[PDB]
Design a protein around this ligand. Structure first.
Ligand SMILES: [K+]
Ligand SMILES: [Zn+2]
Ligand SMILES: [Zn+2]
Lengths: 77, 146
């Protein structure tokens, strides 16, 4: 499943000094995984480090993870 | 942790919080300082409060440690500047920005959580005589925060 950054997403993140595709937890890797039902995007090692740290649920909202969908984000450029 | 701390510093430059600032002390990226203006809607109005922020090596999977430097009178903040706030312990999530932490601390100055106190005697006064609590909080602001 491929997600393409839109122009407005690209503008938004530029104004914020970043990119949409960047994982905002580590600010290092790009987002590779979508958490369900909430839909928060992050990289896999952040999900892993969160659980490894005893963190509960989704690293964003701490909601139960009912699913994890691999994804690929195509930068706007 | 470095990459995340680095983006936090950029985010504060891009979008400076209202009545809040933070940044590293000297050459150590893991020890920052913060300032908070006492919210206008509270007994801390007119005060300027200084805080320390220490990022642990496993940040952001563990919360930063945040404490007041400036003395303050408040049910959730003790004489060592320790802050009882849920997002700094059990409610922490890695996605919280320093900016949101500071804003949560300001909300806590406006609206204390006296049923989960760090200083019981202050919480008791807050729950019972609010006019008195306000009076004392202002005097402490005036004494140590101005
Ligand atoms: K930096
Ligand atoms: Zn990540
Ligand atoms: Zn979530």
């Amino acid at each position: 499943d491929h997600i393409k950054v839109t122009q407005e997403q690209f503008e938004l993140y530029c104004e914020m000094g970043s990119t949409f595709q960047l994982c905002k937890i580590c600010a290092e890797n790009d987002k590779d995984v979508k958490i369900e039902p909430c839909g928060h995007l992050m990289c896999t090692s952040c999900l892993t480090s969160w659980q490894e740290s005893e963190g509960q649920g989704c690293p964003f909202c701490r909601c139960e993870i009912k699913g994890t969908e691999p994804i690929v984000v195509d930068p706007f450029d | 942790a470095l990459k995340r701390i680095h983006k936090e510093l950029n985010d504060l430059a891009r979008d400076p919080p209202a009545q809040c600032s933070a940044g590293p002390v000297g050459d150590d990226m893991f020890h920052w300082q913060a300032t908070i203006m006492g919210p206008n809607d509270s007994p801390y109005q007119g005060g300027v409060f200084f805080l320390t922020i220490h990022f642990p090596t496993d940040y952001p999977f563990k919360p930063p440690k945040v404490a007041f430097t400036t003395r303050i009178y408040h049910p959730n903040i003790n004489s060592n500047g320790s802050i009882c706030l849920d997002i700094l312990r059990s409610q922490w999530s890695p996605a919280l920005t320093i900016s949101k932490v500071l804003l949560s601390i300001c909300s806590l100055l406006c609206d204390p959580n006296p049923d989960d106190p760090l200083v019981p005697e202050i919480a008791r006064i807050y729950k019972t005589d609010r006019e008195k609590y306000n009076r004392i909080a202002r005097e402490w602001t005036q004494k140590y925060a101005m």
